[PDB]
Amino acid sequence: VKKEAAEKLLEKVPSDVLEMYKAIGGKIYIVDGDITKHISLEALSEDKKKIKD
Amino acid sequence: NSSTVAIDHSLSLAGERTWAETMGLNTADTARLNANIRYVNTGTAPIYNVL
């Protein structure tokens, strides 16, 4: 009789395609602190306000 | 008793087109508002620097 030999049908593995999608990449955006300056006097005042006759 | 000696060469041309869509959201900052308003004086004296 003649031997099969068996060279196989399956080629490589999914693992390369699996690794392709497995890509995670970079996520999220900068927020919160930004720059922050601010300056004006809407908080408190100062002006002569007494009483007399 | 047999002995089989073999060799293979191979090519592969893989073309791929990928479409992707993403919708991000933050539950605390979903919406921003804007009002369209007017000021009405039904009184008798005028008022200045209205806030």
d(CA B8, CA A5): 14
The Cα-based distances of A45 to A39, A49, A50, A52, B49 in angstroms read 14, 11, 15, 21, 18
Quoted resolution (Å)? 3.3
Backbone angles phi, psi at B17, to 5 degrees: -125, 125
Considering only alpha carbons, which residue of chain B is nearest residue A2?
B2
Using the beta-carbon criterion (under 8 Å), do A5 and B8 form an inter-chain contact? no
Using the beta-carbon criterion (under 8 Å), do B6 and A3 form an inter-chain contact? no
Query: Which amino acid is present at B51?
Result: L
Question: Obtained via which technique?
Answer: cryo-EM
∠ Cα A38 A41 A46 (to 5°): 160
